Amino acid sequence: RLRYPPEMPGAEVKVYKKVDNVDLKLYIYKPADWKPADRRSAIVFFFGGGWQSGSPAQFRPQCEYFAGRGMVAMAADYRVGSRHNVKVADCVADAKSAIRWVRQHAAELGVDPQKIVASGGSAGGHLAACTVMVPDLEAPEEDHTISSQANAAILFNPVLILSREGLKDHVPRQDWEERLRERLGTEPKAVSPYHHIRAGLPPMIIFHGTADNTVPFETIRLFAEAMKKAGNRCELVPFEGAAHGFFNFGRGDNLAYQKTLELADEFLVEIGFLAPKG
Numbered sequence: 001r002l003r004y005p006p007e008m009p010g011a012e013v014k015v016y017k018k019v020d021n022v023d024l025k026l027y028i029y030k031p032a033d034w035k036p037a038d039r040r041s042a043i044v045f046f047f048g049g050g051w052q053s054g055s056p057a058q059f060r061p062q063c064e065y066f067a068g069r070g071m072v073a074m075a076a077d078y079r080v081g082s083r084h085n086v087k088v089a090d091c092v093a094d095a096k097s098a099i100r101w102v103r104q105h106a107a108e109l110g111v112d113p114q115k116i117v118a119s120g121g122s123a124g125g126h127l128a129a130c131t132v133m134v135p136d137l138e139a140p141e142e143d144h145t146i147s148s149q150a151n152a153a154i155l156f157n158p159v160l161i162l163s164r165e166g167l168k169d170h171v172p173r174q175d176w177e178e179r180l181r182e183r184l185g186t187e188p189k190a191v192s193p194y195h196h197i198r199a200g201l202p203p204m205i206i207f208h209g210t211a212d213n214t215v216p217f218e219t220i221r222l223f224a225e226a227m228k229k230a231g232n233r234c235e236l237v238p239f240e241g242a243a244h245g246f247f248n249f250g251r252g253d254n255l256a257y258q259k260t261l262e263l264a265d266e267f268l269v270e271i272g273f274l275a276p277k278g
């Protein structure tokens with residue numbers, strides 16, 4: 001019941017990438033007092049759906065929230081398996097193309113090109129994480145010299161471990177890695193945020209349910225532990241007993257929705273991307 005293509009009432013629509021004969025769109029929400037020479041922080045949301053399905057509609061409520069707070073907030077479309085027959089590496093390239101485009105067009109968007117936040121849920125959280133910390137896998141036909149790298153991330157139960165290398169798997173299952181290579185369209189490590197943990201990365205906040213049966217909470221704890229040891233600001237907010245998707249607008253009386261927004265907001269204030277309320 002999440003429509004594709006979404007209505008996105010009140011959004012300005014921009015095509016950020018043309019590829020395989022599809023126009024990939026950003027649904028852009030500006031604040032009421034937006035003017036062209038502004039230098040606002042921006043946020044780009046990537047929907048979840050296993051890199052197979054989903055809709056930018058998922059993050060419309062969050063875009064409206066952050067536009068109300070003075071950000072240029074947007075939800076990005078990206079290619080997925082069920083509609084475009086792509087693999088995960090393609091989705092990653094699209095997400096990188098979105099951040100590049102916003103940076104490239106920062107002036108006309110009224111945006112500070114160094115305050116661009118990547119955000120998303122599950123598979124889309126994975127994409128957001130890739131824009132912050134995984135090297136580009138392919139050179140774009142558009143905007144070649146602009147960085148794709150986001151300046152911060154806000155992740156809603158992301159997928160962050162996509163390879164089993166350097167883990168405590170008791171037997172070598174190189175076969176599992178070969179199968180992953182075929183599914184992902186590249187070497188699994190090359191789209192596995194966990195395998196790119198290093199010092200000097202942009203800051204992030206992660207919301208994850210401790211009862212998540214799709215993405216184990218322990219994968220996220222490992223990630224955050226390692227990020228902190230590398231000296232990165234990586235705030236892990238557990239939601240005790242919560243399941244995958246807990247944060248969505250319309251779930252559990254919107255309590256987790258509201259809480260994640262408050263905390264994401266405080267994060268952005270903490271890192272200097274938003275003015276304190278008032």
Ligand SMILES: [Cl-]
Pocket residue numbers: 211212213214243244
């Ligand atoms: Cl779950």
